[PDB]
Design a protein around this nucleic acid. Structure first.
Ligand SMILES: CCCCCCCCCCCC[N+](C)(C)[O-]
Ligand SMILES: [Mg+2]
Ligand SMILES: [Mg+2]
Length: 395
RNA sequence: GCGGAUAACAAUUCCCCGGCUCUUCCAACUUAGGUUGAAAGAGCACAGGCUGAGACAUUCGUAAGGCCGAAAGACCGGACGCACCCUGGGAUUUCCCCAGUCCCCGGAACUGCAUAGCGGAUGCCAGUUGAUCAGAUAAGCCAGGGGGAACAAUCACCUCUCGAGAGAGUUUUACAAAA
DNA sequence: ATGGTTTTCTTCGGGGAATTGTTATCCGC
DNA sequence: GAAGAAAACCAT
């Protein structure tokens, strides 16, 4: 019911409600459909670029961010819910730290120790206890000294944030810019909540500081208590996606046309821009089979292994059973590092356009199925690639 | 302004379980060979990018000053030593950019270290061939983290008809006025 | 029946130690 | 999420 308009110069204009005029404009070539959702058209002719003030209200969250644009009278012209991938970041970073430590131990430290043992350049006692500065307890260095441990004097800029905190802050800032692309936002209101979630608390001062440099003299702050009062006074239904509506309407001095937005908000999903991991599966389990049935997982138990190993099998079975055993160790699997990534736009073999949620299956170097953001699976060989992932996607 | 408490998530180094390839030897099971296992030993460690030496061991040295001792030295201290600190320049590094780690030259203030780190000497571990460059050369560094740009087979809402086709549905992108 | 193709279903490396750091909130002097 | 094996299928 609301169409977004962009001028010929590319400057956002006010939304229209005259859908018949939009259809006529597109029919005669005076406009082009820039985006499917939200439906946006760019004018081809030249006209006045005159816009009334619009207020943007941000309900901030780690997982769900609400955004609502209202007019000076309180009419709502845009509501969006953004689902972020912030929770993924700490686990990916922890996995990366573990992989880096494994790289630096298996490929560097152990090889150096092997070379020292082979060359006779090792400790006479074989191991040494080193007490390093800043430590009260020693470390054990086997056959050679440790590589220098650097933890005494490491500095960061004032205001340093973790990759997770930076991700949340940059996501909050990026959704505002994407909204500014379609709408002429004049004022921004941010909800500030009293202390009672750690990353959000870390970024709120930074978000407020950088939201005031983007809107000089047009940045406002509201409280979660004011949202409750607004909901009680104006009767807005209790729903999270409506909270941003109560935030933007907090900036309006004389509210006359105030009503809860009717319809469903736009839903935005976040997809990672890079996947730098080459390996898919490091199959490190040496499985033993007795007549097609698995009986042991390794020669001895690995760390935190509940399943029996070959040691238990040998202890509980004869020599003729161990002598008749088959070994399966699947090779490591690797991803296609130049694959079609989630968030991409494709058209199926029947003309259906969809956003890629994931790729399932593979045969003869080809993806089997493309699963979209609605759950439907499409034959990937009869699908055509249209657009790459752009980070934030309407679905 | 400082101190304390709480939470989140960032970094360096070390140690282990397990995994892969090969050798020796023993055992079991099978058609001299083959399969599985035990023991001992050796090598190996995302796909990759950069780099030509930098890893290791022993030994010597590592300011002034204070304090203990007669005997070198112990402790404090910290610089004229070193740096994770700081200026500049780089690798990873790319469609654009960053984070993190690391390297090189230098050392005003700040910060940190002296059982460390750095340097010297001695030993040990590479590669070497094609026309000054190129090649080769590891016990060298980084590598599984984040955003953005660009890329469409982009026509939505409403009405009518049988998912498909057609359509001024009030005028301006919009307010205002007008209809 | 045999060979090729599509659909369902399964599965993915861990532990410890010597240390350090940043951001936010709150409290107190 | 993504790769790959087993099952299931459909067939000529
Ligand atoms: C948070 C929801 C944001 C949805 C808005 C999507 C922004 C797309 C902007 C397209 C405009 C491109 N162009 C060339 C006209 O500038
Ligand atoms: Mg809120
Ligand atoms: Mg490699």
């Amino acid at each position: 019911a609301v169409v977004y308009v962009i001028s010929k110069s590319g400057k956002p204009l006010m939304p229209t409600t005259r859908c018949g005029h939009v259809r006529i404009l597109l029919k005669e070539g005076k406009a082009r459909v820039v985006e499917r959702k939200p439906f946006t058209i760019q004018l081809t002719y030249e006209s006045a670029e005159e816009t009334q003030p619009l207020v943007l209200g941000i309900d901030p969250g780690r997982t769900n961010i609400g955004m609502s644009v209202v007019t000076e009278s309180g009419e709502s012209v845009f509501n969006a819910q953004i689902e972020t991938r912030n929770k993924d970041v700490p686990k990916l970073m922890k996995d990366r730290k573990q992989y880096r430590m494994a790289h630096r131990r298996l490929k560097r430290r152990c090889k150096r120790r092997r070379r020292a043992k082979a060359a006779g350049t090792a400790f006479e006692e074989g191991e040494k206890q080193r007490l390093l500065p800043g430590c009260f307890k020693p470390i054990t260095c086997k056959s050679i000294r440790n590589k220098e441990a650097r933890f005494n004097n490491r500095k960061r800029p004032v205001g340093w944030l973790t990759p997770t905190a930076n991700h949340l802050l940059v996501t909050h800032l990026n959704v505002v810019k994407k909204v500014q692309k379609i709408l002429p936002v004049a004022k921004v209101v941010l909800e500030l909540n009293r202390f009672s979630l750690s990353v959000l608390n870390q970024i709120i001062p930074y978000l407020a500081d950088q939201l005031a440099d983007m809107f000089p003299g047009n940045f406002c702050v509201t409280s979660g208590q004011d949202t409750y009062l607004f909901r009680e006074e104006h009767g807005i239904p209790k729903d999270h996606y409506l909270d941003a509506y109560c935030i933007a309407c907090s900036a309006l001095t004389d509210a006359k046309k105030v009503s809860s937005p009717k319809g469903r908000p736009y839903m935005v999903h976040q997809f990672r821009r890079h996947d730098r991991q080459a390996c898919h599966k490091a199959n490190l389990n040496r499985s033993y089979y007795m007549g097609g049935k698995l009986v042991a997982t390794n020669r001895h138990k690995a760390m935190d292994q509940k399943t029996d190993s070959l040691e238990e099998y040998r202890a509980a079975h004869s020599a003729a059973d161990v002598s008749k055993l088959t070994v399966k160790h699947p090779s490591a699997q690797y991803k296609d590092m130049s694959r079609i990534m989630p968030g991409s736009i494709l058209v199926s073999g029947e003309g259906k356009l969809f956003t890629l949620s994931r790729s399932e299956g593979r045969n003869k170097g080809q993806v089997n199925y493309f699963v979209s953001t609605e759950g439907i699976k499409y034959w990937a060989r009869k699908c055509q690639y249209l657009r790459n992932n752009g980070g934030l996607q309407i679905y």
